[PDB]
Amino acid sequence: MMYKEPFGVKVDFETGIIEGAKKSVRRLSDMEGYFVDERAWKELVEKEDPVVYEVYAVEQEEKEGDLNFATTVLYPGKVGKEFFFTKGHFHAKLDRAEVYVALKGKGGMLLQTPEGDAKWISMEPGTVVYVPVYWAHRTVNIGDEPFIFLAIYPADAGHDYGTIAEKGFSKIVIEENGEVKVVDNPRWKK
Amino acid sequence: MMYKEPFGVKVDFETGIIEGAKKSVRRLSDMEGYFVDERAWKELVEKEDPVVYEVYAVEQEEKEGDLNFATTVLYPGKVGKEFFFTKGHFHAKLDRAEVYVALKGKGGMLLQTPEGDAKWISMEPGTVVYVPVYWAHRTVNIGDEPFIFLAIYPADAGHDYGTIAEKGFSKIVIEENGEVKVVDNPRWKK
Numbered sequence: 137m138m139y140k141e142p143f144g145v146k147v148d149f150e151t152g153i154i155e156g157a158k159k160s161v162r163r164l165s166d167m168e169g170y171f172v173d174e175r176a177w178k179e180l181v182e183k184e185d186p187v188v189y190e191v192y193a194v195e196q197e198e199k200e201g202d203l204n205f206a207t208t209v210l211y212p213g214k215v216g217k218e219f220f221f222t223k224g225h226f227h228a229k230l231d232r233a234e235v236y237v238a239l240k241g242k243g244g245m246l247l248q249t250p251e252g253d254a255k256w257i258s259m260e261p262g263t264v265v266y267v268p269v270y271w272a273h274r275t276v277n278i279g280d281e282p283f284i285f286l287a288i289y290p291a292d293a294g295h296d297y298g299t300i301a302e303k304g305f306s307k308i309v310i311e312e313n314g315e316v317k318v319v320d321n322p323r324w325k326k
Numbered sequence: 327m328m329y330k331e332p333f334g335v336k337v338d339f340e341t342g343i344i345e346g347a348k349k350s351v352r353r354l355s356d357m358e359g360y361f362v363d364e365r366a367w368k369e370l371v372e373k374e375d376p377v378v379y380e381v382y383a384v385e386q387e388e389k390e391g392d393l394n395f396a397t398t399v400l401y402p403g404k405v406g407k408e409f410f411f412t413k414g415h416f417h418a419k420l421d422r423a424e425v426y427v428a429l430k431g432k433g434g435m436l437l438q439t440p441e442g443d444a445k446w447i448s449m450e451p452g453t454v455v456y457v458p459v460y461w462a463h464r465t466v467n468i469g470d471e472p473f474i475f476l477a478i479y480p481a482d483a484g485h486d487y488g489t490i491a492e493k494g495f496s497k498i499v500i501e502e503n504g505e506v507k508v509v510d511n512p513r514w515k516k
């Protein structure tokens with residue numbers, strides 16, 4: 137038995153950056169078919185193709201009992217009425233929980249069961265969200281500034297994007313009459 | 327099946343307090359046989375029996391894939407030359423990692439393998455520490471203010487305090503001549 141070396145890394149709570157982490161960038165062009173308003177999506181991709189979110193991940197070999205962590209910086213914006221959000225996923229191993237820690241900004245988490253039953257959890261700095269086993273989860277930025285959070289998750293959880301990519305979430309988070317509303321997705325399969 | 331409800335809880339990054347969490351308090355009298363200077367321990371217990379640390383825990387039923395989280399508020403102080411620390415433990419399931427996030431104050435983590443090989447990791451706010459499988463871990467407050475951190479750990483990791491209670495750590499963290507030092511534990515056997 138060799139032992140893995142313990143380590144510390146600095147996370148800047150204001151920027152979300154973790155030095156030496158695997159950085160990933162999701163631009164709007166990378167999210168075709170995720171937003172309700174396809175015409176608003178095409179127009180925004182043409183004009184700007186803005187970054188929707190960036191992820192800084194510190195990941196281990198996929199093995200039972202080990203833990204990954206990542207920050208996400210979710211930028212503010214709307215595609216039509218719909219606030220910017222992360223793609224969303226179930227874990228590849230469904231029976232894996234996750235803990236989120238909100239660091240900066242205003243947002244929330246949309247969760248749904250495999251049957252499409254939905255839950256909205258508000259997130260402000262200091263909110264810790266527990267994502268239980270079997271729940272798909274997507275984060276949403278509802279404010280004017282970046283929404284930054286840290287996720288800690290089992291190293292073997294994986295990501296299943298496919299199911300969400302096709303069917304989506306049963307709820308959408310929109311601005312309507314200057315109010316943030318969590319409403320039925322008109323294009324929800326079921 | 328019955329799904330576990332997702333939930334959000336507020337963590338105050340300034341105080342470590344989690345709303346509605348299971349609170350535990352460890353006083354100096356709860357830590358007989360932990361500190362090198364037994365006479366200093368006895369004198370301080372008699373004079374004050376200070377609170378050494380408090381823990382606010384949000385725990386799930388012990389099952390693979392699930393996650394617990396907890397804040398600790400580690401108070402400043404010394405027993406003789408030795409800084410206040412947590413009892414320290416291995417996980418009962420040794421193959422379980424943990425992630426710590428430092429929130430306030432100045433401190434660090436002492437880690438040790440089953441063979442007694444040791445490592446110190448400095449923690450200042452924003453430091454995330456990865457505790458690998460098979461490492462015992464103890465946090466230490468090396469400053470004049472509370473050292474506050476959040477730990478996220480597998481719900482089935484459990485706690486093995488007994489090994490540490492009997493053998494201690496191979497290194498100790500002290501103040502000598504106004505300098506903070508990590509040095510060999512004189513009472514360590516090996």
Ligand SMILES: O=C(CO)[C@@H](O)[C@H](O)[C@H](O)COP(=O)(O)O
Pocket residue numbers: 191206208222223224225234273274275287289293294295
């Ligand atoms: O939930 C996790 C990991 O299990 C987060 O680290 C997300 O992966 C990240 O916020 C990006 O979101 P997705 O693009 O993966 O939905």
Ligand SMILES: O=C(CO)[C@@H](O)[C@H](O)[C@H](O)COP(=O)(O)O
Pocket residue numbers: 381396398412413414415424463464465477479483
């Ligand atoms: O590592 C963990 C849990 O696995 C921390 O939440 C500690 O339990 C806490 O800092 C108190 O310290 P101990 O008294 O448990 O050493």
Ligand SMILES: [Mn+2]
Pocket residue numbers: 225227234273289
């Ligand atoms: Mn996830």
Ligand SMILES: [Mn+2]
Pocket residue numbers: 415417424463479
């Ligand atoms: Mn632990």
